[PDB]
Ligand binder design. Structure first.
Ligand SMILES: O=c1cc(NCC2CN(C[C@@H]3Cc4ccnc(Cl)c4C3)C2)c2cc(F)ccc2o1
Ligand SMILES: [Cl-]
Ligand SMILES: [Mn+2]
Ligand SMILES: [Mn+2]
Ligand SMILES: [Mn+2]
Lengths: 671, 670
DNA sequence: AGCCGTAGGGCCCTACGGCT
DNA sequence: AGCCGTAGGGCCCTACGGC
């Protein structure tokens, strides 16, 4: 744990706080052991502005610091008892390191304010480009960050205690809405004042969580971790027709290439995209144990294999035709997509769920046939209304099936982006023999843990909080599908029992809609229409850019083809012209001038292999050339009449609906 | 946590024992929840043959089977209290599953012997091709293994209790040697009798660990994990000139392609190869917290990055030149090297350390100049004596420097493969002012944890087990290197204190030399000479094959160039021939016919780009031909004569020693 | 309540041989 | 005794918002 220095003269000593043991090892290896101590922490640290005291005092990482500092806390804070006069925060140089810093200041500020007032609290400034202090060699760390001769600490200054109380309460407090407002007002897409630092550090954290972690893009419906996963699967060509591949490779690969975060965030995001109880349309095809509806985790990543689903191909379809803008990855050594072509409205179809900072999102999945007809109808009428859409899109369609009670929250969510929706299991009452009945549950509400739900029921019977239940079993199986059996006592009204379980168990459960997604890179709450409007315009830009791309590429080809026909019509002079040229450059120049060729045409000829002279290519080329001219007119046509552009989108979407659309699962009963 | 079945009638109740919760998931998803209970365990389970009773009674996974079985054990075993009539062992279908099988039986036999007597014990037979049962889809597991209508269970049958007795004790007992005899005796390079299965399961496990895990190869000194790692580094071109790559993806890559084992075994083996205090010549070049001599682990693999060292390039040099035999990986989707060319004696240079089954290895690191001078001397005197070799190779050379006391143990290790080697820290006594002194240690023995040792010293001071010390400081730094200061009480005899310290602490330690390596695929205790003979033999083959390889490719290419030269000699004919051929196939036949070309020459011409017709290109074509002709002769000379070939290896080894040889670090004192 | 899902962070048991 | 290194297997805390 704590790696203390040897000098017991506090005023000369210093303790450094690092995010964990990985960072601690480099920090132990580079320090001057005489005067520098190290306490590795354990990641995110309790937000003592939110927690109550008993929990605070029983928190190990806190206790370690109090112990380590020796000054006591609060009323008993005794600054003279300090064992170091420099406490240095040295978190990783990332937003998460910045968050932790805010977490640490909050504590010092809430429980050790004089420590700040005496200027005992400093902030190391380690350099960027490292995932964590564990990535630095021990000599670079000491020099950049720990050598007093050159390190650049920032002593924490406390200017206006009134301004600081509000900051910690605003930034780190129970009340989300002031958090959210501070972000909205400040989001923009030697010594240090503790107010600016908290504001500046925490805003970078929040913003990063919002636009690059927890919320999905309206266009493709994806978060970066999923976008990176499927992209990585794409880039490695791991498609449905190819065999499965090991999850660990994938994770390490994506982690090295696109997603610089722990394997668990990567592995578990990939796991969910494969669970058919999680994804209305699974994007990942899984080989092996990928968890269960009882809350069983997936097998460890070394055991499992995965690959793209077929529908995933439509997300990536046309990605290499300049339909979307690529960007550089975290270290610059790679390009990654900012968004996928998403040839189907993935956001609504699979829905979404995220806890951000200052906000959350909660978007239910939907039936794909309805959505496309939804997008189809919108394609034909920009002023279409919400209720006219719910003729196509009757509502959410959970991968778990089950039932929905009434259309009242559906409509409010679609009109406002927020609304509440009751999900009911599918339960029938049936006879079990000898004058007794049983309740049989074959479908459960979305995101509900079956075992947990069974547990609670057992809990009520045992607690006599519910009367009339005799036995309780889970007969679920592969051969059966879900089958949960509740045996009722003879001559009891099974229906009153059922109505109790809905009220008293997750047997009935509510989905709270909170459709926030990223719109032009900014979080926005959207109603159903804006969600569809955005996907549509996305599809418009996609098909357009793709058409503009196929067109550049065809004109290039013909120009090369024009050049090659010439070469063929004068090959003997071509050859000798070449034979008598010392350098390519000489030849390049000579070809251009004699035959009015461009460089490409001229290059393409030089690269032409002898085998291309066979007697028949000249028409093969001629043949190819002519179709090319028909293709170009065809393309030029689409880019010159937006209505033509639109109908093609309709066609390709229609094509999608026929292939992948399916029946509704969730029954919507009028409440 | 047992997943019990809803029913409660032992007559029809089966409990499936599986390695863990990953395996337990698929099993639960495909089983019949009505009648099949599942108890996931936690990997290698306690060897009850080697454990102490109280310790056994307090083992968690043991207690769980009992509690689950509900029949007690040993004396108070009450078969009537059985809660299942089938205890089905469903370990993964790997050698480690087989080991775990042997460990379960051992417990059943020794403590629940009636179960077997009653025939209640069964062995599921999951199909091969899977890593564990978590890689299976539930339906596949149910159909092939759990469905009573298609499965092929084996019921366990005791047949001779004296035989079983002797066997269990032989296999699982703490007597290593009877286990070793059994292997060497039986090494090969429905129902089921319990003796047959144990014998067969255990032997299968031991074989695998002997030949494919724990022992290095005499030729390259590598264990399979190291080899596959370095090889993997090579295939991905993670070379010293290129930049570091994240450990995590290397691990994932090595694991997927070559090493189907836990990332911990992969990462830590990689880490060891990069620690300058573990490897005498680090094979890996690592970036970040790769641990310390204090037993600090490395940083997690999401944090670190790695690449080959330069010297690793010499382990891998010319692997493409058909120098070693490739093999199929574990699933036939890849090829991997059987050994590396090892253009330097890696076995002795970095030594090896490995607990196997029935045996272990402990080879110490050595100085490379010496090693290579050893080989060089050997190469001129097949009959050189071990003493003559020690004139090159004075003894091990630990990465940690330090002292070795005497040479009789060395001399014993090198002549027998075995011998004991007393190591000591480098400690001096110096004054600190005021007539006082201190003991300053600047080097510690090999593989000694430094912090532990200091903590050990502080205990004896506390426990008063030693007297005369007033302070004890680890003043180590990157600028200092190692420096541990023991402050001595004024007028004490600091030498006397130093002497007690050596007796009571790892300040002195011994290295037990146990030089066992894989020779022709089999484990062997070798002497130093043997080790070098095989190395040199390895180098001989490697360079011969490279040369034979280099010769075929040159000949191929010269052949091709001969065809381009002809095409150049008659380009106009060439053009006509092609221009009046309707297809490439027609053209190709015409070129062969018209120019007496082989098919391959004919294609090279067809593929020739127009740009090859310019004056510079044709020169390049002619020039490369002329060089090839000379290179070809050079090669043939070497195959014409063994001394020439033999002289080359010396040259290349000498080359290597000049590039990488360094000074001795460990001092051999008399 | 505590859970939902992307995030920060980390340690334990077992087998096996041989040396102290 | 318990350490040396390749191996089987697995789990906890924290932040974040909404209900
Ligand atoms: O970044 C990573 C991390 C990987 N890590 C292996 C997993 C981390 N290990 C699980 C926990 C660790 C730990 C600590 C303390 N206590 C407990 Cl219980 C545990 C269990 C296995 C990884 C593996 C790959 F194949 C490829 C890329 C990888 O990239
Ligand atoms: Cl070419
Ligand atoms: Mn970090
Ligand atoms: Mn309910
Ligand atoms: Mn296993």
């Amino acid at each position: 744990k704590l790696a203390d220095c040897s000098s017991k003269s506090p005023e000369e000593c210093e303790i450094f706080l690092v995010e964990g043991d990985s960072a601690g090892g480099s920090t132990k290896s580079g320090r001057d052991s005489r005067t520098q101590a190290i306490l590795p922490l354990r990641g995110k640290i309790l937000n003592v502005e939110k927690a109550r005291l008993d929990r605070i005092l029983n928190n190990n990482e806190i206790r370690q610091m109090i112990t380590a500092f020796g000054t006591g806390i609060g009323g008993d804070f005794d600054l003279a008892k300090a064992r170091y006069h420099k406490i240095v925060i040295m978190t990783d140089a990332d937003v998460d390191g910045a968050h932790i810093r805010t977490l640490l200041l909050t504590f010092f500020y809430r429980f050790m304010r004089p420590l700040i007032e005496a200027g005992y609290v400093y902030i190391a400034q380690p350099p960027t480009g490292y995932k964590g202090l564990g990535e630095m060699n021990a000599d670079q760390l000491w020099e950049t960050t720990m050598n007093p001769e050159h390190r650049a600490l920032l002593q924490v200054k406390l200017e206006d205690a009134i301004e600081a109380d509000q900051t910690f309460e605003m930034l780190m407090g129970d009340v989300v809405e002031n958090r959210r407002q501070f972000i909205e007002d400040n989001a923009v897409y030697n010594e240090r004042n503790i107010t600016s630092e908290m504001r500046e550090s925490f805003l970078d954290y929040a913003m990063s969580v919002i636009v690059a972690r927890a919320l999905p893009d309206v266009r493709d419906g994806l978060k970066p971790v999923h976008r990176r996963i499927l992209y990585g699967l794409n880039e490695q060509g791991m498609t449905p027709d190819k065999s499965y591949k090991k999850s660990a490779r994938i994770v390490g690969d994506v982690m090295g290439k696109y997603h610089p975060h722990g394997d668990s965030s990567i592995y578990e995001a990939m796991v969910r995209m494969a669970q058919d109880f999680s994804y209305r349309y699974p994007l990942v095809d899984g080989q092996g144990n990928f968890g269960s509806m009882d809350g069983d985790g997936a097998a460890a990543m070394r055991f499992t294999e995965a690959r793209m689903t077929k529908i995933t191909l439509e997300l990536l379809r046309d990605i290499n035709k300049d339909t979307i803008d690529f960007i550089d990855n975290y270290d610059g050594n790679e390009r990654e997509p900012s968004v996928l072509p998403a040839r189907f409205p993935n956001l609504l179809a699979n829905g979404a769920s995220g806890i951000a900072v200052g906000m959350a999102t909660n978007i239910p999945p939907h039936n794909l046939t309805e959505l496309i007809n939804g997008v189809l109808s919108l394609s034909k009428n920009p002023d279409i209304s919400i209720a006219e859409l719910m003729e196509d899109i009757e509502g959410p369609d959970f991968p778990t099936a089950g039932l929905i009670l009434g259309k009242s929250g559906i409509r409010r969510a679609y009109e406002t982006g927020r609304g509440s929706i009751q999900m009911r299991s599918r339960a029938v009452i049936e006879e079990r023999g000898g004058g007794r009945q049983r309740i049989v549950v074959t479908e459960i509400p979305f995101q509900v843990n079956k075992a947990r739900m069974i547990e609670k029921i057992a809990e009520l019977v045992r607690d006599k909080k519910i009367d009339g239940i005799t036995d309780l079993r889970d007969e679920t199986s592969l051969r059966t599908g879900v089958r949960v059996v509740i045996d009722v006592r003879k001559d009891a009204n099974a229906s009153v029992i059922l109505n109790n379980l809905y009220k008293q168990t997750p047997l009935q459960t509510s989905f709270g809609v909170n459709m926030i997604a990223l719109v032009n890179g900014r979080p926005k709450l959207i109603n159903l229409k804006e969600a569809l409007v955005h996907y549509l315009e996305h599809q418009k830009t996609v098909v357009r850019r793709r058409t503009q791309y196929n067109l550049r590429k065809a004109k290039d080809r013909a120009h090369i083809l024009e050049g090659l026909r010439i070469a063929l019509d004068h090959i003997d002079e071509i050859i000798s012209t070449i034979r008598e040229s010392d350098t390519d450059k000489v030849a390049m120049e000579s070809l251009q001038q004699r035959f009015k060729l461009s460089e490409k045409q001229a290059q393409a000829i030089l690269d032409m292999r002898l085998r291309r002279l066979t007697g028949l290519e000249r028409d093969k080329i001629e043949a190819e050339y002519n179709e090319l001219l028909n293709y170009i007119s065809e393309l030029e046509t689409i880019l010159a009449d937006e209505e033509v552009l639109l109908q093609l989108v309709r066609d390709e979407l229609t094509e999608i609906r026929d292939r992948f659309g399916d029946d509704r699962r969730t029954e919507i009963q009028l409440g």
